[PDB]
Design an enzyme around this catalytic site. Structure first.
Site, short mmCIF file in Angstrom:
data_model
loop_
_atom_site.label_atom_id
_atom_site.label_comp_id
_atom_site.label_asym_id
_atom_site.label_seq_id
_atom_site.Cartn_x
_atom_site.Cartn_y
_atom_site.Cartn_z
N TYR A 46 40.61 97.42 102.53
CA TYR A 46 40.40 96.00 102.78
C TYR A 46 39.42 95.38 101.79
CZ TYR A 46 42.53 97.10 107.38
OH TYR A 46 43.40 97.47 108.38
C1 F43 Z 1 43.84 103.96 110.50
C2 F43 Z 1 42.80 103.18 109.67
C3 F43 Z 1 43.01 103.36 108.16
C4 F43 Z 1 42.51 102.05 107.59
O1 F43 Z 1 42.34 101.79 106.41
N1 F43 Z 1 42.44 101.16 108.59
C5 F43 Z 1 42.99 101.66 109.85
C6 F43 Z 1 44.43 101.18 110.06
C7 F43 Z 1 44.51 99.67 109.93
C8 F43 Z 1 45.87 99.03 109.87
C9 F43 Z 1 46.88 99.73 110.78
C10 F43 Z 1 48.30 99.81 110.22
C11 F43 Z 1 48.55 101.04 109.40
O2 F43 Z 1 49.65 101.36 109.01
O3 F43 Z 1 47.45 101.63 109.01
C12 F43 Z 1 45.44 97.60 110.24
C13 F43 Z 1 46.58 96.74 110.83
C14 F43 Z 1 44.79 96.84 109.06
C15 F43 Z 1 44.91 95.33 109.14
N2 F43 Z 1 45.79 94.76 108.33
O4 F43 Z 1 44.20 94.69 109.92
C16 F43 Z 1 44.39 97.88 111.28
N3 F43 Z 1 43.85 99.01 111.10
NI1 F43 Z 1 42.32 99.73 112.34
N4 F43 Z 1 42.98 98.59 113.90
C17 F43 Z 1 42.56 98.53 115.17
C18 F43 Z 1 41.51 99.25 115.76
C19 F43 Z 1 40.83 100.25 115.05
C20 F43 Z 1 39.69 101.08 115.58
C21 F43 Z 1 40.22 102.20 116.48
C22 F43 Z 1 39.15 102.87 117.34
C23 F43 Z 1 39.52 104.26 117.77
O5 F43 Z 1 38.52 105.10 117.74
O6 F43 Z 1 40.64 104.56 118.13
C24 F43 Z 1 39.04 101.59 114.27
C25 F43 Z 1 37.86 100.77 113.77
C26 F43 Z 1 36.53 101.26 114.28
O7 F43 Z 1 36.29 102.51 114.01
O8 F43 Z 1 35.79 100.56 114.94
C27 F43 Z 1 40.20 101.52 113.32
C28 F43 Z 1 40.25 102.25 112.18
C29 F43 Z 1 41.24 102.26 111.18
N5 F43 Z 1 42.14 101.34 111.03
C30 F43 Z 1 41.30 103.35 110.11
C31 F43 Z 1 40.82 104.69 110.70
C32 F43 Z 1 41.02 105.92 109.82
C33 F43 Z 1 40.37 105.84 108.47
O9 F43 Z 1 39.17 106.34 108.49
O10 F43 Z 1 41.01 105.72 107.45
N6 F43 Z 1 41.13 100.62 113.75
C34 F43 Z 1 41.11 98.89 117.14
O11 F43 Z 1 39.96 99.00 117.55
C35 F43 Z 1 42.06 98.01 117.92
C36 F43 Z 1 42.68 96.91 117.08
C37 F43 Z 1 43.44 97.56 115.93
C38 F43 Z 1 44.10 96.66 114.87
C39 F43 Z 1 45.55 96.24 115.15
C40 F43 Z 1 45.79 95.52 116.46
O12 F43 Z 1 44.88 94.61 116.70
O13 F43 Z 1 46.86 95.56 117.03
C41 F43 Z 1 44.12 97.66 113.70
C42 F43 Z 1 44.02 96.93 112.35
C1 LIG Z 2 40.53 86.47 107.10
C2 LIG Z 2 39.35 86.54 106.10
O1 LIG Z 2 39.18 85.32 105.44
P1 LIG Z 2 38.94 83.91 106.28
O2 LIG Z 2 38.27 84.17 107.61
O3 LIG Z 2 38.14 82.92 105.47
O4 LIG Z 2 40.28 83.30 106.55
C3 LIG Z 2 39.57 87.65 105.05
N1 LIG Z 2 39.00 88.93 105.47
C4 LIG Z 2 39.36 90.14 104.71
O5 LIG Z 2 40.10 90.07 103.78
C5 LIG Z 2 38.77 91.52 105.11
C6 LIG Z 2 38.65 92.59 105.91
C7 LIG Z 2 39.57 92.49 107.15
C8 LIG Z 2 39.99 93.89 107.66
C9 LIG Z 2 39.39 94.23 109.05
C10 LIG Z 2 40.49 94.73 110.02
S1 LIG Z 2 39.77 95.64 111.42
S2 LIG Z 2 40.78 97.48 111.61
C11 LIG Z 2 40.15 98.61 110.33
C12 LIG Z 2 38.82 98.04 109.78
S3 LIG Z 2 37.69 99.41 109.36
O6 LIG Z 2 38.11 100.70 110.03
O7 LIG Z 2 37.79 99.80 107.90
O8 LIG Z 2 36.27 99.03 109.73
C13 LIG Z 2 38.92 87.25 103.73
O9 LIG Z 2 39.60 87.15 102.67
O10 LIG Z 2 37.67 87.03 103.69
#
Ligand code: F43
Ligand SMILES: C[C@H](OP(=O)(O)O)[C@H](NC(=O)/C=C\CCCCSSCCS(=O)(=O)O)C(=O)O
Ligand code: F43
Lengths: 114, 259, 194, 351, 47, 296, 251, 221, 50, 93
Positions: H200
């Site tokens: 990200y």
């Molecule tokens: C799988 C990943 C890889 C990465 O780069 N981001 C991920 C995955 C990414 C992808 C999932 C799709 C995919 O194909 O990967 C997206 C959708 C990124 C986005 N565009 O917002 C997402 N997560 Ni993440 N992600 C979530 C969440 C979470 C929670 C999960 C907690 C747990 O212990 O199970 C944690 C964040 C944290 O540690 O606080 C988390 C981590 C992670 N998240 C780490 C964990 C592994 C890593 O170390 O690489 N997600 C959640 O907390 C719920 C919401 C959820 C988001 C999608 C939804 O809202 O439907 C999603 C949001």
């Molecule tokens: C949406 C926002 O911009 P805006 O609020 O001004 O529209 C936009 N934010 C981003 O690009 C960045 C990070 C978003 C990813 C967070 C998804 S939460 S799930 C895994 C997150 S973690 O495990 O790595 O902590 C930006 O360009 O600053």
């Protein structure tokens, strides 16, 4: 799609209306069909379903699948007529000519539906 | 001078947080994992082979003359020049001895030149590979900061920090890096921290008993020690919040009289 | 036309307004001819792509069993560079329940590289001919590239004891399967069962 | 509030907003207003008074749902990044059909989640999976409902609905008590913890409940966000975790910026929005900020939060979406029984 | 089809050279450069 | 004396709770572990109800009172086709499972049609081998009224149909016809609850009739004794290897290879063959046990 | 039915239409006729799809990403790995989540128009790649045009992301770049098993979704405030390159 | 409305491409300041601080009661007033971030900037600022020194976000005192973390400038 | 010339997988005028049929 | 005894349906996505397509610049006209 059921059973009307709606949603056929009218005759077992499509053979196969989904189990003897309006009569008995006449009546009343 | 306090509070959780933050507190060790075993679970390099380099040693490269930059002694891995690797940990909410923000604060208070990152179900520290292996063996794995059941060295798929423990008291693992061996009663890592299988499983020791886990944890829980039993920490948090609010409103001495 | 009796599962489904099946459960159709394997009790696999195939087999006159895998999501741990997301696997009891049937029908997904290793691990313990039902077109040669027995493209070093007997493509997860796909499945089962 | 003034609500077809962007809508309404004015009063088809009508309908008397976001944000008007929290509070019509202030705040929470986190953050500035479980955690089970009802009960037992003036002490007391209760409920019930498995979900729900309670105590929106930020930094010391790294940017600068008076930092929470500089990156805050802004006025029993014209316009029974019960409408849409507009089946061949 | 000839697969288009023919279970099979058996009816001769 | 309930808790420290159940004399009838939660159908003595509730609240478990977890139900769908199988029939079966009962889907060979419908004697006897039968009928009054001969068994009967009120001489529950959707509306859930109430009433009446003259041995502890003695019961791949019926058991082994082993089982000081009617089952050549009463 | 008595279309009020002959309209070089109302963009689905296909197109180059993968990340980049990445992005671009069944995903039939394609001026990489998701320059262009385009492009590899049309319907045009960038980053960290929590992943994210992004239109300032991939930002040469008549015609 | 494909450049971007009004002077990235000063530590710090605090004067932020805090921040963070940055670096040559926090608290106690507020039941004598702006300036100088110490130990520029974040965290929960910019520095450190440590994220710390939505929140600290 | 401004845009829109084929823009506008153009972006699978 | 081919089940709670607060409806998680939910799309559509224009300066322009009196009959005629013109009907030309 316009859905109506002609039946003398109060619960069966609503249930088969929901059945027709579900079968149209499952095959993704609700927008390609203008009207879907089903006539339920259960005292003498025979059912007629008429379909008025919007404006290929895959669409006709999907419509035949829809009739197979809506028509009850025991009504296995089936005969369909297609002249841009697809109407099929299903019965457990061999299809009588009066039932076919009612099928053509449904087809003609669905042709002028607008 | 100034004698450093580390954390407010009178409970055992606050005491454990103070002990973790204290660099002069010797953490109690509970297992012996060899250096090559820690390297194998880490999965970055083959044990016995030399460290890969990202740049020449600092004597070889020529830099500009900087008095302030040269005051700080570099790490040994920075002196030789080594790639920056990571070790990642997941900590269960059910009385894991180390917790992510506590881990990050203790790492940044105890170790030199580290990159700490805190998530809800993740905590990663990045450093040069030799120094990272050194404090991974000395502090991160063999001491009371680690429990093979409620904590786990895992990258890639992390999930299960908020889930309940399994039948053996271990944290849920979607990739199953570590399994339980009931014949010896020990946890064995069959995969490294990223997920590829290990040729020989490595004993990280047995799970810590729950009675000890209540004493050595750094998390607040209703079934354990709650913050309602520790009003000093809540008062400090509220004071920090009020001081931030008053500084953001008008940052003068007269507005801080209502602190 | 004959009586068809199913030994239903002993465990209730997923809540009140959810799925009817449960993970890690088997439902015996008495006479064991075809077993339908579902990856999960979720909406992506149950009643939209699996129970439709099931009623097509039951309408064809062939008794059907439905087994829901305990861990059907993800890729096996023997995939290159380990597994990610979730670990796919098969229990010995699940393999024994499959192996008492004359034929198997298994529903797979989208990614080509996931399906081949999933089928390899599934056929490492299943020795009956199985039919793979997926969405994207996978050729019945890429399974032999990793050592899977196959009716048309054999491998030199076969790492599975079961043979892929048919690949059927065009069935999307969580969606209603058309009558044509059901007819292809029925024709394949009839041509490869008796 | 409106006065003896007449207003027109123009609702252009949804297909127009689907083919084009949100900046199309005001111009479409302006040309049709000018056209109807010149042909209903039998005026000349193009004169200087027509330009007066066009200028009036384009700016002088127009009311946009969202402001344009030029520059870095690079977006037009009537986009979900331009919609302030008070405007979205006035969009939801639970105030005129219910007397429960917690329910009025929580329907605004659900609408704000489904807008800001699911659409504006889910796709407008991200992609793919989006944030469904981040936003549905605020309106799926009654976890936030139970927490907010506890907040209301605790406030009414010791302060009242408007029994105290907004000071620091009441913010600390209410926000700390509600945060401690919410985290104790997470500790006591493993089902609640496994439902809100991500820490960001838990933090947002607990802080939303604390801010709603502070608003039900004082009636001030900025005290509500101050309680939200205290709840976040108290959650961080309770569980030693807050969320994904990237979540607590605005939570760290929040306490300073909540009651600030500087140009870039000061704004009332009704006037704040997704283009507020702290709020312009992160999921898990904006929809609950809108609910806190609503809860500021639900404690007072106010008819509207920021705009009376928006409240009256969205009280229209001819709208396709029922804004009195947003959660019931979302449930209807999840069960394939919601009839939506903007479809084009009469111009398409049969499949 | 014999050893040293150039063959292709109709279903995908995998180029390879015939290694050997090894009959089994009274059925003809063709072994290619990638150590994968094939069927002669699913193979065609190209030049 | 043996109340049968369902426990829903976690797998952590579940073995200690199983040890407590074994210590107090309880029997674990059914166990299933999904990922981290376990569903446990346990029969414990009635004097330990409050102690088990205190034990379950110690491990943050849930006690669900299941009124049907001692019986097996035959659900008689007219066929296993798309019309009746993939919805309604599984909804009825899973709702029956939610209250502890073990269901069996009975698809009739010629159960479809209005006048061409018929029921075979083999299917009839398979229906009579169960404790209670539920018929899932259609949504037309005349069709079901001309179909009474299908409901011809000396078993408690509940008929589910589309019309709200039917004039058949059997127990009838309305608003449950042939549908194509999952039962989720309020009226459908109310009708499912009504059907559960009628089958619960019939099962309670049959339980009182059996309690007038009790059997020699309860089926639950007889199943426990069979699992203790017969070592091939853990090798059964069926869903429920031993189904606890109202006044007997259904052991899912081959009858020809195992009836002499089952009959020669000493419970207490009695042999099983003198106290139970071990007979061949119509269901996949299984073993069916019918208990005698204390009068004989 | 729907409006419960509210008037919608009243031909009686306003201008009396049809005082002159309402002529039909031919379409040039085509032998078919239509009314003028059929050529309105709201009544014509082909014009809507013409704009939809342009709006949902983002071209991203993968040469800095491959160089970062080979050197900084220490991961080999083979044509097999590129095929694996293409399979991953083709699953993940519409709504997909790779090996995460717990993740909420978009219905696949709702995004049937979504594709991820690849093209390259490197010929041996082109024949070593899978033809399922390859835009072949040699077989789609004449020989002189293919040679000119390969000379102008070079020996570089580019991916074409076709975000599903419904995303552009619900959201605006600037949504497309963020959607494609997010899915490209996710598919890159999934197909190549990389850690998503180090600074090297941030450098790779810049190299993969912020280094060689080609957008269809630029953002517009002032009172015409709009995001990228809106038709006011499309230059005349870009639109000339969108139309492919030089491929099939010499006139 | 920009110079994209041209060959003419300036240190300032287009005024219509600013994050906020008065943000023109926060457009010079970190790498431009480092290259202009020929990779000199104190000179690059002075350049960045001068531009950032002059921008806060341009924004109207350093007007009235905030002018003293911004002048003190500029003097103690960028221009090495009273040799604070050099003294902290010299005292923590072998040290860590926590040792820098300890030396900062010791210096602020010795100079009379902070005093003991009250002692709780479990020890932990709370600290309050006798001079709020001077305490902020001391904490900012210590923040610069902590970044220098940790990044000179690692000899890598990837540690900036964690050092700022956990310097502020350790200082706040060690003293009960506010951090640099009353949490705005910690929030901007969280921004640096998610911008330079994930998929990200995008780019490294060398392209950090105050005219970005990620990094705009701290007013030159 | 093979292209006018951008070679990458020219190659990208030569893709046969595009629903609108830009080789004959006049012919497809005729197809959309005669209601024989199958467009994308229709939410037919998430909407009721009644 | 350790078999790496058993697999790990994941997401048991996430397979159970989601309730909605203050309602009685249970739905799948996949149906709560904004792309899969037509109600969320219509919720944003109704906000996006709404524009409020004050018709008081226009009446003043009609009254004092053009000399045209504005009565509720003329307002009703204008409303009848604009309900035809706003969808896209033709009034002149
Ligand atoms: C799988 C990943 C890889 C990465 O780069 N981001 C991920 C995955 C990414 C992808 C999932 C799709 C995919 O194909 O990967 C997206 C959708 C990124 C986005 N565009 O917002 C997402 N997560 Ni993440 N992600 C979530 C969440 C979470 C929670 C999960 C907690 C747990 O212990 O199970 C944690 C964040 C944290 O540690 O606080 C988390 C981590 C992670 N998240 C780490 C964990 C592994 C890593 O170390 O690489 N997600 C959640 O907390 C719920 C919401 C959820 C988001 C999608 C939804 O809202 O439907 C999603 C949001
Ligand atoms: C949406 C926002 O911009 P805006 O609020 O001004 O529209 C936009 N934010 C981003 O690009 C960045 C990070 C978003 C990813 C967070 C998804 S939460 S799930 C895994 C997150 S973690 O495990 O790595 O902590 C930006 O360009 O600053
Ligand atoms: C009222 C205006 C003032 C204005 O801003 N637009 C008008 C009307 C407007 C309305 C027509 C409303 C309706 O259908 O009743 C719209 C569609 C703009 C809109 N989005 O509302 C339009 N014109 Ni005009 N308008 C057009 C045209 C024209 C040509 C007509 C030539 C002639 O015969 O005199 C003239 C310009 C001229 O001064 O020459 C013209 C004028 C005018 N045009 C004059 C006076 C009309 C009158 O007859 O009283 N349009 C045309 O030249 C053809 C294209 C046509 C546009 C719609 C389409 O493309 O189908 C339409 C475009």
């Amino acid at each position: 799609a316009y859905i109506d059921v002609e039946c003398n059973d109060e619960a069966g009307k609503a249930i088969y209306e929901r059945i027709i709606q579900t079968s149209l949603e499952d095959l993704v056929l609700g927008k390609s069909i203008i009207k879907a009218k089903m006539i339920c005759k259960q005292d003498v077992p025979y059912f007629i379903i008429g379909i008025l499509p919007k404006s290929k053979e895959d669409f006709i196969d999907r419509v035949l699948d829809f009739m197979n989904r809506v028509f009850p189990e025991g009504m296995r003897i089936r005969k369909t007529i297609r002249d841009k309006t697809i109407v099929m009569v299903a019965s457990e008995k061999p299809i009588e000519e009066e039932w076919m006449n009612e099928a053509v009546k449904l087809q003609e009343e669905l042709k002028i539906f607008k | 001078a100034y004698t450093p306090q580390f954390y407010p509070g009178a409970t055992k959780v606050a005491e454990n947080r103070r002990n973790h933050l204290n660099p002069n507190y010797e953490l109690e060790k509970l297992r012996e994992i060899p250096d090559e075993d820690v390297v194998k679970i880490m999965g970055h390099r083959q044990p016995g082979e030399d460290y890969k380099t990202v740049h020449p040693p600092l004597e070889e490269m020529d830099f500009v003359e900087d008095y302030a930059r040269d005051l700080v002694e570099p790490l040994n891995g920075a002196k030789e020049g080594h790639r920056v690797r990571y070790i990642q940990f997941a900590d269960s909410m059910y009385f894991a001895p180390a917790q992510p923000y506590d881990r990050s604060r203790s790492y940044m208070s105890r170790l030199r030149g580290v990159d700490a990152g805190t998530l809800s179900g993740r905590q990663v520290v990045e450093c040069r590979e030799s120094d990272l292996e050194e404090f991974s063996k000395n502090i991160l794995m063999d001491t009371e900061l680690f429990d093979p059941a409620t904590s786990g060295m895992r990258g890639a798929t992390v999930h299960g920090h908020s889930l309940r423990l399994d039948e053996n008291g271990m944290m849920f693992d979607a990739l199953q890096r570590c399994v339980f061996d009931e014949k010896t009663g020990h946890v064995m890592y069959v995969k490294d921290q990223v997920g590829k299988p290990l040729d020989a499983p490595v004993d990280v020791g047995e799970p810590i008993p729950e009675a000890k886990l209540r004493e050595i944890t750094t998390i607040y829980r209703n079934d354990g020690v709650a913050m309602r039993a520790d009003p000093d920490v809540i008062e400090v948090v509220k004071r920090i919040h009020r001081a931030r609010t008053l500084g953001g409103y008008i940052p003068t001495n007269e507005t801080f009289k209502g602190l | 036309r004959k009586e068809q009796i199913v030994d239903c599962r002993a465990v209730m489904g997923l809540g009140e307004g959810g799925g009817l099946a449960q993970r890690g459960t088997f439902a015996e159709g008495l006479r064991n001819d075809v077993v339908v394997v579902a990856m999960s009790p979720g909406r992506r696999h149950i009643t939209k792509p699996v129970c439709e195939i099931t009623y097509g087999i039951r309408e064809a006159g062939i008794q059907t069993s439905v087994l829901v895998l305990d861990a059907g999501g993800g890729i096996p741990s023997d995939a290159p560079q380990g597994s990610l997301g979730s670990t796919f696997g098969l229990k010995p009891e699940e393999a024994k329940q499959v192996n008492r049937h004359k034929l198997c029908v298994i529903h797979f997904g989208n990614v080509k590289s996931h399906i081949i290793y999933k089928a390899r691990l599934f056929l490492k313990y299943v020795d009956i001919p199985t039919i793979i039902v997926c969405q994207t077109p996978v050729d019945m040669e890429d399974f032999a590239a990793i050592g899977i027995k196959t009716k048309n493209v054999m491998p030199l070093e076969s790492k599975t004891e079961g043979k892929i007997v048919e690949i059927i493509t065009g069935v999307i997860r969580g969606e209603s399967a058309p009558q044509k796909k059901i007819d292809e499945i029925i024709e394949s089962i009839k041509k490869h069962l008796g | 509030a409106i006065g003896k003034k007449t207003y027109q609500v123009s609702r252009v077809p949804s297909l127009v907003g689907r083919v084009c962007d949100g900046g199309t809508i005001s111009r479409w309404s302006a040309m049709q207003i000018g056209m109807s004015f010149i042909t209903a009063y039998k005026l000349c088809a193009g004169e200087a008074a027509t330009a007066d009508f066009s200028y009036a309908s384009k700016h002088a008397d127009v009311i946009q749902m969202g402001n344009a976001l030029p520059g870095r944000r690079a977006r037009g008007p009537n986009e979900p990044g331009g919609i302030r929290f008070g405007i979205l509070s006035d969009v939801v019509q639970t105030t005129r059909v219910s007397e429960d202030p917690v329910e009025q705040s929580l329907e605004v929470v659900a609408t704000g989640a489904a807008l800001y986190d699911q659409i504006w953050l889910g796709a407008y500035m991200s992609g793919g999976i989006g944030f469904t479980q981040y936003a549905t955690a605020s309106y799926t089970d009654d976890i936030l409902d139970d927490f907010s009802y506890y907040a209301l009960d605790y406030v009414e037992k010791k302060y009242g609905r408007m029994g105290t003036k907004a000071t620091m002490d009441v913010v600390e007391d209410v926000a700390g008590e509600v945060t401690l209760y919410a985290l104790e409920q997470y500790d006591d019930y493993p089902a609640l913890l496994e439902d809100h498995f991500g820490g960001s979900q838990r933090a947002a729900v607990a802080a939303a409940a604390s801010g709603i309670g502070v608003c039900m105590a004082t009636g001030n929106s900025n005290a509500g966000v101050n309680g939200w930020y205290l709840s976040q930094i108290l959650h961080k010391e309770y569980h030693s975790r807050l969320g994904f790294y990237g979540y607590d940017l605005q939570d760290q600068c929040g306490a300073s910026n909540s009651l600030a008076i500087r140009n870039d930092e000061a704004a009332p929470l009704e006037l704040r929005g997704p283009n507020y500089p702290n709020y312009a990156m992160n999921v898990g805050h904006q929809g609950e900020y809108a609910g806190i802004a609503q809860a500021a006025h639900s404690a007072r029993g106010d008819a509207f939060a920021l705009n009376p014209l928006v409240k009256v316009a969205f009280a229209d029974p001819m709208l396709v979406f029922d804004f009195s019960k947003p959660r019931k409408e979302i449930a209807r849409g999840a069960l394939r029984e919601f009839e939506a507009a903007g479809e084009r089946d009469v111009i398409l061949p049969a499949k | 089809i014999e050893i040293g000839s150039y063959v292709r697969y109709i279903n995908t288009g995998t180029h390879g050279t015939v290694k050997a023919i090894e009959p089994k279970n009274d059925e003809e099979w063709v072994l290619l450069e990638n150590d994968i058996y094939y069927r002669p009816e699913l193979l065609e001769l190209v030049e | 004396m043996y109340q049968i309930i369902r426990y829903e808790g976690g797998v952590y420290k579940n073995n200690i709770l199983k040890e407590w159940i074994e210590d107090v004399g309880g029997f674990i009838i059914q166990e299933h572990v999904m990922q981290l939660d376990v569903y446990m159908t346990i029969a414990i003595p009635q004097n330990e109800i409050e102690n088990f509730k205190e034990e379950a609240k110690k491990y943050k478990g849930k006690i669900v009172e299941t009124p049907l977890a001692g019986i097996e139900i035959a659900i008689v769908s007219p066929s296993l086709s798309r019309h009746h199988l993939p919805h309604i029939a599984c909804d009825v079966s899973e709702y029956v499972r939610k209250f502890g009962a073990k269901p069996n889907m009975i698809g009739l060979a010629h159960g479809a049609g209005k006048n061409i419908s018929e029921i075979r004697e083999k299917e009839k006897r398979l229906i009579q081998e169960h404790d209670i039968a539920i018929y899932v009928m259609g949504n037309f009054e005349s069709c079901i009224l001309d179909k009474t001969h299908l409901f011809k068994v000396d078993i408690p009967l509940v008929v589910t149909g589309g019309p709200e009120t039917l004039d058949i001489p059997y127990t009838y529950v309305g608003n449950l016809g042939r549908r194509a959707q999952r039962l989720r509306k309020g009226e459908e859930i109310r009708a499912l609850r009504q059907m559960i109430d009628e089958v619960t009433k019939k099962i309670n009446d049959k339980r009182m009739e059996l309690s007038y003259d009790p059997p020699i041995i309860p089926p639950v502890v007889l199943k426990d004794e069979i699992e203790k003695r017969i070592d091939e019961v853990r090798g059964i791949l069926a869903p429920m290897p031993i189904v606890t019926q109202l006044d007997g058991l259904r052991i899912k082994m081959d009858y020809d290879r195992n009836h002499e082993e089952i009959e020669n089982v000493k419970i207490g000081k009695y042999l099983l063959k003198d106290i139970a009617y071990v007979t061949r089952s119509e269901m996949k050549n299984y073993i069916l046990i019918k208990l005698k009463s204390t009068s004989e | 039915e729907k409006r419960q008595g509210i008037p919608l279309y009243n031909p009686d009020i306003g201008v009396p239409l049809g005082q002159r002959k309402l002529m039909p309209y031919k379409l040039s070089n085509t032998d078919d006729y239509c009314e003028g109302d059929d050529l309105h963009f709201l009544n014509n689905a082909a014009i809507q799809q013409l704009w939809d296909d342009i709006r949902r197109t983002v071209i991203v180059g993968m040469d800095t990403a491959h160089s970062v993968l080979e050197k900084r990340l220490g991961v080999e980049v083979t044509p097999e790995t590129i095929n694996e990445y293409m399979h991953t992005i083709n699953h993940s671009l519409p709504g997909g989540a790779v090996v995460q069944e717990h993740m909420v995903e978009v219905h696949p039939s709702l995004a049937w128009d979504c594709y991820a394609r690849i093209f390259t001026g490197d010929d041996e990489l082109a024949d070593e790649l899978d033809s399922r998701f390859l835009i072949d320059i040699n077989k789609l262009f004449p020989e002189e045009q293919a040679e000119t385009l390969k000379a102008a492009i070079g020996k570089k590899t580019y991916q074409v992301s076709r975000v599903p049309s419904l995303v552009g319907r619900v959201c605006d045009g600037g949504t497309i770049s963020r959607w494609s960038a997010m899915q490209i980053g996710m598919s890159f960290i999934t197909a190549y098993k990389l850690c998503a929590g180090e600074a090297a992943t941030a450098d790779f994210s810049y190299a993969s979704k912020h280094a060689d992004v080609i957008q269809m239109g630029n953002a517009l300032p002032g009172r015409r405030a709009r995001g990228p991939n809106e038709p006011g930002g499309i230059r005349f040469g870009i639109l000339s390159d969108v139309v492919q008549t030089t491929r099939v015609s010499e006139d | 409305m920009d110079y994209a494909g041209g060959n003419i450049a300036s240190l300032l971007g287009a005024p219509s491409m600013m994050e906020g009004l008065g943000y023109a002077l926060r457009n010079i990235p970190v790498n431009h300041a480092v290259a202009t000063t020929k990779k000199n530590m104190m000179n690059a710090i002075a350049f960045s601080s001068v531009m950032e605090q002059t921008a806060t004067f341009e924004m109207g932020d350093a007007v009235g009661s905030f002018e003293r805090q911004h002048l003190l921040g500029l003097a103690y963070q960028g221009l090495n007033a009273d040799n604070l940055v050099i003294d902290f670096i010299k005292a923590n040559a072998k040290g860590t971030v926590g040792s820098v926090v300890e030396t900062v608290i010791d210096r602020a106690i010795a100079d009379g900037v902070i005093v003991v507020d009250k002692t709780m039941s479990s020890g932990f004598n709370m600290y309050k600022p006798a001079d709020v702006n001077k305490w902020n300036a001391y904490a900012a100088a210590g923040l610069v020194a902590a970044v220098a110490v940790s990044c000179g130990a690692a000899r890598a520029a990837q540690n900036v976000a964690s050092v700022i974040l956990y310097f502020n965290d350790i200082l706040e929960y060690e003293t009960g005192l506010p951090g640099v910019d009353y949490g705005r520095s910690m929030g901007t450190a969280v921004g640096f973390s998610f911008f330079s440590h994930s998929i990200y994220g995008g780019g490294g710390p060398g392209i950090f400038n105050g005219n970005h939505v990620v990094t705009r929140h701290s007013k030159g600290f």
